[PDB]
């Protein structure tokens with residue numbers, strides 16, 4: 001099938017899904033390749049073409065270091081790019097129902113990866129199931145990551161910072177100007193993403209330039225107020241310079257960029273890892289910064305003072321968000337044994353996750369998380385919760401609380417089902433990033449998951465779809481639990497699992513009081 005867009009014609013491909021058919025347009029360019037003099041600069045508008053652009057395969061993934069901690073292991077390799085890496089990577093994908101819809105709601109996915117990795121061609125981000133089952137149009141895009149996408153030199157158009165965020169924004173603009181041609185409704189666009197993707201979504205809720213580019217937002221395990229989500233102006237500076245020295249580019253800050261623009265992508269990727277003296281396993285070396293363009297002030301200030309797009313949001317986290325990072329630096333941990341660690345190892349673990357923190361700061365963490373209720377796995381579980389609560393759960397809850405205080409309906413979920421096919425060991429539980437497959441409906445495919453998981457995925461897909469279409473995450477036909485709005489007082493949230501869905505209140509009340517009130521002082 002051939003669709004006519006503002007920049008030219010594009011041909012897609014037909015896909016057979018669940019006895020039906022979906023039309024996919026993989027790899028549509030949405031900006032001039034950020035190459036040469038364009039490296040480090042904001043994305044430039046694309047040059048219109050003649051003839052038909054074949055959008056029948058995923059495009060290149062942006063340059064990024066790859067996870068090599070477990071060669072041959074599907075647990076980690078499933079997140080690695082499955083497409084050739086290249087600086088020429090500003091492309092997006094579109095999955096539309098068949099027959100062509102007339103005014104369908106649009107779901108725009110923004111992948112996570114700590115702003116350093118990720119790509120939209122991953123198997124778990126395939127939008128064809130949603131396009132098929134819910135008749136929504138699914139869009140996803142690749143955006144620059146790492147130094148190539150977030151190198152910051154505030155005020156300098158050569159390397160202003162947040163380039164990756166601008167790529168996402170330019171992609172959202174593309175949908176505004178072109179989605180109607182694919183039978184989509186530019187007035188009904190819901191953004192959703194996980195981890196850094198979620199933090200990205202939350203930042204679009206704060207960026208004036210993105211206000212008119214979408215309707216609603218879904219944030220899975222992430223928000224800009226997460227401690228790893230925004231790079232301080234000081235950090236950015238010390239990192240841009242450290243990268244300069246490491247590539248023999250130290251200089252006129254503008255000449256520094258000119259020098260870096262001659263370096264080979266690999267030389268840059270190779271040195272990104274040492275810009276931080278003692279980084280944590282989250283390793284967000286180059287991320288969003290208050291640039292004065294995309295972000296006009298410290299996000300915490302904007303959130304606190306109600307300066308953001310007023311709309312409905314759906315926010316949530318997984319039960320064991322932190323476990324996954326333990327095997328990437330925490331001493332005594334391993335995906336090949338029960339990882340029963342000691343108090344001493346736990347203490348060294350804190351050193352790893354809280355590098356620049358005072359000794360008293362770490363002791364307070366120990367004090368708060370070690371009042372045992374003896375059990376050999378006490379420290380193993382405490383460290384996991386420490387990492388999860390500090391980096392994801394508490395920041396997500398705080399964001400939800402503050403956001404809803406300004407009148408908008410908000411819904412919060414607590415994902416507690418561990419995939420029956422999870423490659424990681426049992427002690428890691430309901431891991432970070434493993435609810436994604438349920439949202440994209442992979443379990444709907446019987447060729448693979450238990451019956452219970454198929455049903456769970458179906459319910460989630462319906463709730464996510466209803467939220468996108470109507471701003472209300474309900475499943476109204478199968479006598480399902482009603483999802484209550486989250487309010488600052490009651491703080492009700494919904495648990496998602498195979499057993500039975502429940503309405504609970506004040507998730508991690510004691511732990512977040514610690515991370516949100518006390519800790520920020522030390």
Ligand SMILES: *[C@@H]1O[C@H](CO[C@@H]2O[C@@H](C)[C@@H](O)[C@@H](O)[C@@H]2O)[C@@H](O[C@@H]2O[C@H](CO)[C@@H](O)[C@H](O)[C@H]2NC(C)=O)[C@H](O)[C@H]1NC(C)=O
Nearest residue numbers: 234235238239241242243244245246274275276277278356
């Ligand atoms: C800001 O950066 C300095 C310099 O970092 C060093 O040079 C970079 C290019 C990279 O190779 C880093 O690994 C180097 O550390 C940091 O100061 C260094 O701190 C480490 C701590 O282990 C020490 O070993 C070095 O001697 C220090 N180098 C200098 C010149 O002071 C500094 O810590 C960074 N600032 C912050 C807030 O972390």
Ligand SMILES: *[C@@H]1O[C@H](CO[C@@H]2O[C@@H](C)[C@@H](O)[C@@H](O)[C@@H]2O)[C@@H](O[C@@H]2O[C@H](CO)[C@@H](O)[C@H](O)[C@H]2NC(C)=O)[C@H](O)[C@H]1NC(C)=O
Nearest residue numbers: 327329330331332333334335336337338339340341342345
């Ligand atoms: C779980 O494994 C860790 C890591 O050890 C490695 O992986 C194992 C599966 C096995 O292949 C080992 O030979 C590998 O070295 C164990 O942690 C190590 O413990 C020893 C002694 O306590 C220590 O000298 C190492 O530095 C540790 N390595 C690190 C940094 O984790 C851990 O003891 C194992 N847990 C169990 C079952 O006790």
Ligand SMILES: *[C@@H]1O[C@H](CO)[C@@H](O)[C@H](O)[C@H]1NC(C)=O
Nearest residue numbers: 010011051052053054055056
């Ligand atoms: C696009 O695919 C069609 C398939 O028949 C082919 O004819 C055409 O040459 C392709 N376009 C390019 C530029 O290769």
Ligand SMILES: *[C@@H]1O[C@H](CO)[C@@H](O)[C@H](O)[C@H]1NC(C)=O
Nearest residue numbers: 102103104184185186187188
């Ligand atoms: C799509 O729906 C919007 C309202 O949500 C409406 O304004 C627009 O005309 C519709 N587009 C179509 C079907 O032409």
Ligand SMILES: *[C@@H]1O[C@H](CO)[C@@H](O)[C@H](O)[C@H]1NC(C)=O
Nearest residue numbers: 455458459460462475477478
């Ligand atoms: C509702 O229940 C039916 C049959 O009991 C099931 O096949 C279907 O998947 C469910 N629909 C949703 C949206 O969960």
Ligand SMILES: CCCC(=O)SCC[N+](C)(C)C
Nearest residue numbers: 079112113195324325432433
């Ligand atoms: C590095 C710790 C384990 C991970 O989270 S790997 C990537 C996960 N995701 C891309 C889904 C955010």
Ligand SMILES: [Cl-]
Nearest residue numbers: 359360361363
């Ligand atoms: Cl102390």
Ligand SMILES: [Cl-]
Nearest residue numbers: 479480481501
């Ligand atoms: Cl239910």
